[PDB]
């Protein structure tokens, strides 16, 4: 199959290998207590956390002294989060490879160097969110992504992960974000292209898809993110990247064709845009 090299980054179960909507693909112990931890190897472009029971942004620093704080790192001296791209590179000026590393990888590694709650030898590494409008790297103290159930969130934190135009310039980063994600991770939606399966030397349509109405490319990406692999309901729950991570958006018919099988070839249809749950909800190439 000639598309093997090209379509490799769309084998999300391999390049990413963890939940997308909720990323809790690994476990780690901090001070003797085991906690769940984001482990996806690819950045989740456009993903953010919405706090529905408070007027607080999830990148606000956690409270220190509750509902008035967010999911971000507590203030520190010297300050570690939030740190701009320029601040990060001068903070690691001595290291050679920080010059090479890009914004997202540097932000992920900067968060990984934060010692979790004075546990020098803990596997835990805080996840990070990078803003490309402010060029700020936000280290997330709270690695949780969703707590929204009728048990105690029908009437009030209560929060959910989602794609939003507000989160347009955000990139959710786990500790395992690879430094070569530009080549092995999906970021941009493919214009005039449609995912398909390569069978018997031909690129055919995805055999079975779920068709949902979608008014634009952004909504189709939001739908795909909602139905994508997650490591939380609503090791048994760990998706390992298995899920409805791909969608073919038909612009003319305003349909969002979502499927749970890794695509292996592309089809040229000028009315279609190929999107993945990890892809940026707006950018195109």
């Amino acid at each position: 199959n000639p598309w093997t090299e090209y379509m490799a980054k769309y084998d999300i179960e391999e390049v990413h290998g963890s939940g997308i909507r909720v990323d809790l693909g690994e476990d780690a112990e901090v001070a003797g207590t085991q906690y769940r931890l984001p482990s996806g190897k690819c950045p989740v472009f456009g993903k953010g956390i919405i706090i529905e029971n408070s007027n607080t942004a999830f990148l606000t620093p956690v409270a220190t002294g509750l509902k008035d704080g967010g999911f971000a790192f507590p203030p520190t001296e010297p300050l570690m989060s939030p740190m701009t791209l320029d601040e990060m590179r001068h903070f690691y000026k001595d290291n050679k490879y920080v010059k090479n590393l890009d914004e997202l990888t540097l932000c992920s590694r900067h968060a990984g160097n934060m010692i979790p709650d004075n546990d020098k030898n803990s596997n835990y590494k805080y996840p990070a969110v990078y803003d490309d409008k402010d060029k700020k790297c936000h280290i997330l103290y709270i690695a949780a992504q969703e707590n929204n159930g009728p048990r105690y969130c029908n009437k009030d934190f209560c929060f959910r992960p989602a794609k939003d135009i507000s989160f347009q310039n955000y990139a959710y980063l786990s500790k395992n974000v690879v430094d070569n994600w530009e080549k092995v991770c999906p970021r941009k939606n493919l214009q005039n292209a449609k995912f398909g399966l390569w069978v018997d030397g031909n690129c055919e349509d995805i055999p079975h898809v779920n068709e949902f109405p979608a008014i634009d490319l952004f909504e189709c990406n939001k739908l795909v993110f909602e139905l994508s692999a997650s490591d939380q309901p609503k090791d048994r729950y760990k998706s390992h990247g298995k899920g409805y991570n791909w969608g073919n958006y038909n612009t003319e018919t305003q349909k969002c064709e979502i499927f749970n099988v890794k695509p292996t070839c592309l089809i040229n249809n000028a009315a279609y845009i190929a999107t993945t749950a990890l892809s940026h909800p707006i950018e195109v190439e």
Partner: antibody
Amino acid sequence: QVQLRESGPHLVKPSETLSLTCNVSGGTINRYYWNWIRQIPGKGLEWIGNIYYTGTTETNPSLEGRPLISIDRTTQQVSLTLTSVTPADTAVYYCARTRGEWSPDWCLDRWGRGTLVTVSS
Amino acid sequence: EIVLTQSPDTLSLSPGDTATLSCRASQTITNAYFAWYQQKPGQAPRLLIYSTSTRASGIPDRFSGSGSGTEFTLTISRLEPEDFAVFYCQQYVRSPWTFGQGTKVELKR
């Protein structure tokens, strides 16, 4: 049962700023899109702009970027800030809520009573 | 913007008659994003149908919407006094969302 109510001035001078507020009570502002609709006597209904509780807003280009929409989650009140007003802006302004979050449910199933605003010297 | 044109502008129908309202669009409209509204004097519009056929909550089955592409019609099966009002069509496929100029349905007596 969600009740939407508009509040604002009845008279605004030309070139002034028209500020209107929509007090959302009886239901959440989350997962819903909040609109400002205007019907001028002589024309039909006109759409002004949107706002989601995340902060995202879309406006009508016909208004030439004059309308600014904001939302206060703590007070659950949606505001309209229309600048450089003109007598042609004289009309009845409603705030309407979409049936849901997803695009097919963007029909307006919840409406306020509407408040009349006159623009004149 | 997408232009919606309704016809006829006025109707005088006795109770029990059938009213047919038509709405034409300047460009094709997906069925999922078409709606009809009812407005009484001194009151805000009330949603009747969305997605071109789905009757809103509490709306009697006398109201029925249909159409495809650039043609859409609203039918009121057996008019009764509480139905007579002004009716508007709306599209929400492409911003700006637009309405028709409306149809006034008078009660013939």
